[PDB]
Amino acid sequence: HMGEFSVCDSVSVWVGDKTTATDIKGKEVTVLAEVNINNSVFRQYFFETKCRASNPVESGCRGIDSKHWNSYCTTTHTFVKALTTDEKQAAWRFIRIDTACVCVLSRKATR
């Protein structure tokens, strides 16, 4: 309780019930749960990190000068190569995965 902390709160989970994803080309695609490479079965798990709230505090992110800056927490994404189906083919495509919770700033017009 008494020390360091994130400016925006987050949560990290391992996802194994993922069925749909929006790939790098902007197309909706279906994600399979099991891979098949070199005689073996390993299940597809993705490490995701999302924001807990847009306002961990009403004024936006924590520790920001609310009388000078407008602030909000937003979820950042990354691209991971996964096994997917795009109705016709089964291929390894880069899908959009949630990875961080960053804080964004704008300038207050209030005087």
């Binding site: 990290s12 989970v13 391992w14 996802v15 194994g16 019930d17 490490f47």
Partner: peptide
């Protein structure tokens, strides 16, 4: 020692 595991859902925690 004891052994504990989070179990049988779809997503797990870290």
């Amino acid at each position: 020692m004891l052994c504990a595991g989070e179990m049988d859902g779809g997503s797990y925690t870290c």
